Every structure is written in structure tokens, then in C-alpha cells.
Write a protein that binds this ligand. Structure first.
Ligand code: NAD
Ligand code: NAD
Ligand code: NA
Ligand code: NA
Lengths: 516, 516
């Protein structure tokens, strides 16, 4: 099969009248559809349940965006049976055929992009450009993995010949697995974690995050329209520690693909290490588990450029990114000029209902609001509050952009992932100390350096121990294909999404010799 | 760096007078050195302990073949410190430099091949050709991984470019890990498991199997002479449940490379899944465990060819191979002709002291003898004993080639890894049933089919679910480079040794972007 070389889906900025008109219409239609109910999707059909899940609008939580069915153990069993039955034949599809199926799904998603963006705006409180980036990344995962999968096609392995024999090594998919996805990129990461394994012949049971079940269902509408065979992809909205734990622990689950909190990731990795009664394989678990990401700025930097990138990195999607700048490490000569600029920019940020396209919408839920506000209280006793540190007025979960300064490197707010609009500023002597402080956390996901000094940049390239490092630009928004995404240390297992290597994780190799 | 294309080291057949003379010379030198004591090797020096380990001749177990030091927790800690200290600089060596170091080690090993083979003969009871194949494979691992490592050199990752930026993705080693090695290939697998991770910048603490501590020490003499920097490779002979468990569970062990029994592999994988107090990463564990490997023969086969391959596969190195044919699955039409030929060939096999190059030497230890004889007792209740099934005269652990017939596919002797010269013969209706029986074990390592029917061969290529499948030849003796080695299901994690993919297991990826 021959398609155009991969390119990233452009991210809409809504600067033209045409784009604004399309987005206003999409928002209007999604809003007019509030209260819709979406069933489970199991074995190629929509399947309803007695119990349900409620999805609220975080900008106005009296408003129900939608409801879904609720999967328990019985539905999980049913999905597992469907997924294994499907695997038996799906694994035998030529790669070209599976890859074409992905490309169709990508085309369908692209045609529904404004609707999906609008759904993100209402369901998880993304502003317009954050929503567009999320949908664009989902499209990119499908386009990229469709093409990448062909690189593994029968028989792909380079082996050494032997006289009188054919030696043929090739990849095969693992089986049926479970995908457990986050609420913060519930189109992008949900899609990528599903279609990667599926592209190369696995089948998947997908468990969306509770806060993002409606948009998960719309992604499944796309899969269904694309025509994935029954059982190949299954949609099980439900409670993570219930249906999710049930599948993670199940002897017949082959692999687990997880993105979410470290707390949950640790439990999943531990459980995957155990042989459940009757289990006949060593489970694979891929866990991508957050960060405590720093931007370092030294006295050689463009301080205006640095301040802009820090503000985008810290406050984009309300800081609710595993990649968000939650630490700003300033050398002595950079401290005052950069902090002054960051404060000036940050105090001008707008906060309000996501539909209005503010700089920041609300945080995702009452529980998230509570956690973030709790960390702010902790912070008040660890560092100096210099901006924000309050919830704003309104029913929506609005939190002001917050900055603590003179934060000790070992402070809780300098070590633990807050996952909200809270930046901790740490003052250090020089670039060497900046690197020491940057590395001294349990995490290793993203990092940045603003500096004009070549030797500082190249030093950071070798020694700033994070999986995704950026110089003189924001540290969020890793592009599929361009920046393989994934971290070190307790940021997870280094499963690099949007990279050729990702698909290898969902394959095993067979070696077959015939002596003639 | 440019070297000759990889070729496998030729396995000596000892068909010439010079080869036999050279072997006799090496056997003499080795036995003259039976009194030797070999310390631990930690941080570039030989370090002795108060306690010791004794290595016996399994062909004459009242004869000591050497002693070694015995590592406990203190020595494990010392080695870990040395390994991390070394990692800090070893990781920074250019790949070409690390690869040249391996190539030197291979040249040194090649020049000592007869001595190593003779040590295998006396320490683990390999006959001459088994010993030569083992050392040759060790050389192959070093030559292969030296070359394969260059394929990962900075910056190896194919990424999509982005305007106004350099995007550079590259591999880095993980750190210090532990290698836990088996006694059955204590030069080949011991060497491969160490030099693969080391080639790409990791450092290693190696724990040889108790039964093969002397030959492991001789491999370290080679590493020492080659000039690995202090702390890069460390040698800790000691007890598996003691020093091995201690390292597996340690918060500062980065990865575990294990080859051995399923029982131990299960414990290791479970332990690797846990976050030890103060641990700051998700441990990687590669576990390659046993097999219950079958050869299927159908009525279209060359029955004489089949019988020869079955006898080689079942009884080479006394069946003490994870790849050994322990099941013979015969269709109705093949049963009588193949079984008669197998019995006629097997009844002619010599058993005796390994140095005399018998068809079979002894099993490796009193414990192995005890295990195999116990399974023989179990077998007498499950199937029909038709050949062997007895200990043979002498202090050496000689067990007769043994064949059970009319074995039910679910019998313990048809399911459990005996790891001795014991073949279970299973009668099936047709090829379809033969595949069902072949697949119905917890394991998935090696398998074979003898058949001239193309449709049967190609069906097995697709559906005989083992990592290493061979048609019309023996199922043992996977060659580095030619046949990527590793299994499915409870045969382990499918870490394919002697393959480009192996080295990827010991690397993580960093993505670094600079916006100009
Ligand atoms: N490293 C990355 O690629 C990356 C990307 C996005 C988000 N994240 C992380 O996500 C976290 C916030 O997202 P979140 O709140 O969705 O994370 P979370 O851990 O709370 O939930 C993630 C998913 O796991 C499920 N879950 C919860 N408990 C479970 C259990 N015990 N067993 C099985 N499944 C369970 C949830 O229902 C949800 O689907 C942050 O820590 C952030 O770092 C990481
Ligand atoms: N799958 C493969 O590639 C392959 C290759 C060779 C051998 N084997 C397997 O090896 C087994 C026989 O070898 P073995 O008797 O040396 O295996 P084993 O499990 O008894 O011992 C292997 C190694 O593990 C150590 N060990 C024992 N208990 C331990 C513990 N609890 N924690 C950490 N380490 C521990 C031993 O000291 C030894 O070094 C067979 O099952 C065979 O199939 C497999
Ligand atoms: Na919601
Ligand atoms: Na011995």
C-alpha cells in the first residue's frame, strides 16, 4: 500500500472567520446534544446496562454533558470473550488490510474534528486550541501507526543465512489486552493506546477515564463506522479500580497499556508481575505515569522568549499535563528578570468557561479541584506565594494561575505531581546546580532549557535526565513522529508513543527454519 | 569501525588427528589445574572470601574440579557500588570503543576454546561436540552483539522533522543490572547475557549457576585480560536464593537478565514488578524459562531422517536443554515406523564419563539425578516404559536414554520439564490433532515437524505456537544470528538472543528538540 509521507495534522488556531464559524456551529451542536446516552461497545454492537456513568461539564457542573452505560465484571468477561474470538482471525489479516482500516478511521475522525474538539471543550474543559491539539494528535497516532505497522510486516526480521536452509523470523501480535486511559487527553491518548496494538493484530478492551466517557464513546462511533470487525475494539466505561483492576488481574489478559497516575501505575505494574491462577504467559504492562517537569533558565537566555514558553508550559490546559512545567529553575542572574516577566504574563491570563476560549478553563472535577487547592495550602507553608493561590467565583472548577517562589528543591510542591495551574520557582546558583535540582526528583518525563550558551544546551542534552527535552521552546505538545514521547524513572516504562519502537512492544517474534 | 561480516564460529567435530590431539592436550591442562581456587571479580580485581564453593566432576563426583569464593550480601553491595560507579563513564564510551572491547574478548575466547571446552567436559559433563558448540556459541554472542550494537549508535532513531527545529532521538543504556545464568550453557548463555547489555553501555553483576562456577571464572579471566574497565563486569558465584534474590529485590538494581527454571523465573518476574523501598524506576526483567518441546512426525516424513533428528534432539547433552525434544508426537501412519527407528537408534547410544566423548555423559548433579529418576518413577505410572529408565553403574550420574510410550497428552511427564534423557511418545490421529497436542502445554519454546507435505509445514509455520520452530531437522542448537532464540507463554518473555532486537531491551530512548 502507498500513501503520502506522514505529516502532522495542523492544529487549528481559530484566527480565520471560517474556522471560528465552524467551531461556533460545532459547539452549538454539541451543547444541543447534552444529555445523550452512550452504551458499551462489545463484539461489534452497542450494549446497554442498568447502571450508568454521568459526565459533567467542569465549567458548569450542574450540566450533564452525557451519560454512558457502566461495565462491571460480567461485561468485562463478555468483552474478553469477544476480543479473543476476534483475535483468532484479526491476527491473520494482511498488514496492508489492517493499516487501511486505520487510515479509514483517521479520515472519519478528521471529518468529525470540530465536533470532537467541541466535545472536549464541554466534557473536560479544554479551551479551543487545546481541544484542537488533542484531536489533531489522535489523528496523527492513527496516521503514524498505520504506516509504522507496515515496517513490521511478514517477514520483517533481518537474520543470518545458513547453508541448505531457509531461516525466517517474523513478528506476531500478542493477543487480547486492556487499555486504561487518562481524562486529560481523552481523544489523543485514548486513541493512540488503542490503535497501536490493534494496528499490528492485537485486540483491545478500552477503559476510558470516568471524567471523559462521552468523548471516548464518540471515538468508538468512529471505530464502528470504519468497520473494525466485531471484538477487535471494545469500549468499557466503568470504575478504574473495579472493571480496570478486574482486567489487569485477569489470567486471560495478555497485555496492559496504561497511562495515568503513578499511584495506579505502580499497582498495575506489580499486578502484571504476578501469575494469576491458570495464566499461561508473562504479562506485558506498559505504564506511562506522569512527571515533575522543570524548565531551567540561565542568564544567557532570551528572557522574554523564556517567560512566554514557561507560561504556556505551566498553564496550558490548566497545568493538567504529564508534560506541564511545574518547576521553574532559575540561575541567580536569571532569577529576577525571568520571574518578573513570568508574573507579568501570568497575571494577564483569563480564566472562565472553556466554551468562551479563555486562557484557562476549569480543572476537570471537584476531586481535582480539591487536590489542587490542598497542594496550594501545603505550598503556602513551603514556599512564598506570589500569584494566585485561590479558586475563583462560580460553580465551575476555576483555579487562578498560581506561582510559589523560593521553593526548596525537596519541598512537597517541588517533588509531587499537583496536576493543576501551580508553578514552583526554585532559585539556584548556576547551571550545574540547575541540572542537579532538575534531576533530583523521582520522575523523568519532560524538561526544558532556555539558554543561548551552546555548552549548557549540549550538557543538558547529555545529563538532563528526562525522556523528552526541549531547548528554547515550550516543553508540552510533543508531536507524533517528531518527538517520541515517554519518560524515565517513575515517569513510567519508556514506551515511546508516536515512534516506530512503540509497535514492537505489542509483538513477539517467531523463528522458523526449514532444512531442505 | 569495519570488520568482516558476521559468520558463526565453526563447531569442531574432532574428525582430524590434530583436533583430537589438541583436545587431549587441553583435557590434560584442565585436570592438572583441578586444585585451583577462583575468587570473585569485583571492580576490576579478584576478591576472595572466607567461605567457598566446591565444583565437582559429574562423571566422577568424588573429584573436585575447582573451588571459588562465595558471595553474600556484603559482596553483592560492593559489586553494585562498583557497577554504578563504572556506569557513569562506561555509558559515555563511543559505541565503536565498546564494540572493539567485545571483539577483543571474542579473540581471546577463540584462542582459549579447547581449554574452555575441556572445562565444560569436566565441570558439567558435556561430551566433546556439545562442549565445542557451547564455546562456539559464546564467541558468536560476542561477535554478533559487538556488531549489532553499532546499529543503535548515536543518534539512531528515525524521526519526522519539524520546521525551525532539530529533533534528535537516541538510545542510552539503563544502568547496572544483574545476570543470573544457568548451568547447562555456562559459557554460551552466561557470556551472551552479560555482553549484550554491556555492549550498549550497561554494567553487570553476573551470578553463575552453582554447578558451573569454575568455567564462569575462566570466562572472567577473558574479560579481565580484554580490559573491561573496573566495575563494568563483576563475577559473584554464590547461592541463587541468597545473593541472587538479594540483587533481584534491590532498589538499585535497574534490570535483571535471567535464564533458568520456570519456578525461579516466576519469582523473579513477580519481584521485578514491585517497587522496593526508595526505588526510583520500573525494573525490567527478562526471563527465559523452560520448554516442553515436541517433534511432530507425520506419515509423509523421511522416517530415518526423523529418527536421527529426534535422537539428537532428545538426548543431546543428556536432554538437559530448554530446547530438548521431550515429546514425540506421531500420527497413526508414522507411529510404528518412527518409534521402531527411534528405539533402534537410542538403544545404541553410549553413556559414560564425558571426557571419553560418549553419546551421553552424566546428568549434572546428584539433585538432577534425583529429579530425573523421580520423573521416571512418575512415568512408569503414566505411560509404558520401553527403553532405559535406569541409573547406570558408577559414581558418575549416568542415566540411560529413556523412552515412554502411550503417554496421555495431559500426563505429568507430557507436561512438566524433566530436563533429562527422557522422551515421551504420544500417538495422535492426524496432523491437526498433532498440532493441538503440541500446543497444549504451558510452554512455547522449541518445536519441530518432520513431513514432506508442504501444507503441513506451512500450517505449522502459522499455528505450531513456539518461538523456535524447525522443519526436517533437529530442534536444538539455535545458531546466533541465524535463529533468534526465545519462546512464548511460560517459556519466558521472548527476549530473542542472537538477534538485533535483543540489545533494544537494554536501552531507553531520549528525544531532544532545539528550536533555533
Ligand atoms: N506519562 C504519560 O504519557 C501521561 C499522559 C497523560 C496523563 N498522565 C498522568 O495521568 C495522571 C492523571 O490522569 P488520571 O487522573 O486519569 O490518572 P488515574 O491513575 O487516576 O486514572 C487513569 C485511568 O486508570 C483507571 N484506574 C484508576 N484506578 C485503577 C486501578 N486500580 N486499576 C486499573 N485502572 C485504574 C481510571 O479509571 C482511568 O481510566 C497524572 O499523573 C499524569 O501524570 C501521564
Ligand atoms: N529459556 C532458555 O533460553 C533456557 C536456556 C537454558 C536453560 N534454561 C532453563 O534452565 C533450567 C535449568 O537450569 P537451572 O537449573 O540453572 O535453573 P535454576 O532456576 O534452577 O537456576 C538458574 C539460576 O538462577 C539462580 N537461582 C535459583 N533460585 C533463585 C532465586 N530464587 N532468585 C534468584 N536466582 C535464583 C541459580 O543459582 C542459577 O544461577 C531449565 O528450566 C531450562 O529450561 C532455559
Ligand atoms: Na466530564
Ligand atoms: Na560441576
Amino acid at each position: 500500500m502507498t500513501v503520502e509521507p506522514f505529516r502532522n495534522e495542523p492544529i487549528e488556531t481559530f484566527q480565520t472567520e471560517e474556522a471560528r464559524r465552524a467551531m461556533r456551529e460545532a459547539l452549538r451542536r454539541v451543547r444541543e446534544e447534552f444529555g445523550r446516552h452512550y452504551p458499551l461497545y462489545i463484539g461489534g454492537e452497542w450494549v446497554d446496562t442498568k447502571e450508568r456513568m454521568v459526565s459533567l461539564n467542569p465549567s458548569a457542573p450542574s450540566e450533564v454533558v452525557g451519560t454512558t452505560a457502566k461495565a462491571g465484571k460480567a461485561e468485562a468477561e463478555a468483552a474478553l470473550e469477544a476480543a479473543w474470538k476476534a483475535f483468532k482471525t484479526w491476527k491473520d489479516w494482511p498488514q496492508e488490510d489492517r493499516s487501511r482500516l486505520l487510515l479509514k478511521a483517521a479520515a472519519l475522525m478528521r471529518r468529525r474534528k470540530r465536533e470532537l474538539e467541541a466535545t472536549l471543550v464541554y466534557e473536560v474543559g479544554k479551551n479551543w486550541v487545546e481541544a484542537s491539539a488533542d484531536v489533531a494528535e489522535a489523528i496523527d497516532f492513527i496516521e503514524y501507526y498505520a504506516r509504522a505497522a507496515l515496517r513490521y510486516r511478514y517477514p520483517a526480521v533481518e537474520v543470518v543465512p545458513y547453508p541448505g536452509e531457509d531461516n525466517e523470523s517474523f513478528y506476531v501480535p500478542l493477543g487480547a489486552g486492556v487499555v486504561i486511559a487518562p481524562w486529560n487527553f481523552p481523544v489523543a491518548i485514548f486513541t493512540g493506546m488503542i490503535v497501536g496494538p490493534v494496528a499490528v493484530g492485537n485486540t483491545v478492551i478500552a477503559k476510558p477515564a470516568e471524567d471523559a466517557v462521552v468523548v471516548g464513546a464518540k471515538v468508538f462511533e468512529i471505530f464502528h463506522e470504519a468497520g473494525f470487525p466485531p471484538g477487535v475494539v471494545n469500549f468499557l466505561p466503568g470504575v478504574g479500580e473495579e472493571v480496570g483492576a478486574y482486567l489487569v488481574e485477569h489470567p486471560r489478559i495478555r497485555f496492559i497499556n496504561f497511562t495515568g497516575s503513578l499511584e495506579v501505575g505502580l499497582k498495575i505494574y506489580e499486578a502484571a508481575g504476578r501469575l494469576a491462577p491458570g495464566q499461561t504467559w508473562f504479562k506485558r504492562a506498559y505504564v506511562e505515569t506522569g512527571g515533575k517537569d522543570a524548565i531551567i533558565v540561565d542568564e544567557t537566555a532570551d528572557f522574554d522568549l523564556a517567560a512566554e514558553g514557561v507560561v504556556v508550559s505551566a498553564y496550558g490546559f490548566q497545568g493538567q499535563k504529564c508534560s506541564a512545567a511545574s518547576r521553574l529553575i532559575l540561575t541567580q542572574g536569571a532569577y529576577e528578570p525571568v520571574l518578573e516577566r513570568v508574573l507579568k504574563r501570568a497575571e494577564r491570563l483569563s480564566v472562565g468557561p472553556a466554551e468562551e476560549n479563555p486562557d484557562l478553563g476549569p480543572v476537570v472535577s471537584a476531586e481535582q479541584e480539591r487536590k489542587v487547592l490542598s497542594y496550594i495550602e501545603i505550598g503556602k507553608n513551603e514556599g512564598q506565594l506570589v500569584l494566585g493561590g485561590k479558586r475563583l467565583e462560580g460553580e465551575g472548577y476555576f483555579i487562578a494561575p498560581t506561582v510559589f517562589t523560593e521553593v526548596p528543591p525537596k519541598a512537597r510542591i517541588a517533588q509531587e505531581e499537583i496536576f493543576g495551574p501551580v508553578l514552583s520557582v526554585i532559585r539556584v546558583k548556576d547551571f550545574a546546580e540547575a541540572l542537579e535540582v532538575a534531576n533530583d526528583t523521582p520522575y523523568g518525563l519532560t524538561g526544558g532549557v532556555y539558554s543561548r550558551k551552546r555548552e549548557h544546551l549540549e550538557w543538558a542534552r547529555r545529563e538532563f535526565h528526562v525522556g523528552n527535552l526541549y531547548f528554547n521552546r515550550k516543553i508540552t505538545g510533543a508531536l507524533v513522529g517528531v518527538q517520541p514521547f515517554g519518560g524515565f524513572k517513575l515517569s513510567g516504562t519508556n514506551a515511546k508513543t508516536g515512534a516506530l519502537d512503540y509497535l514492537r512492544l505489542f509483538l513477539e517474534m517467531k523463528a522458523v527454519a526449514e532444512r531442505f
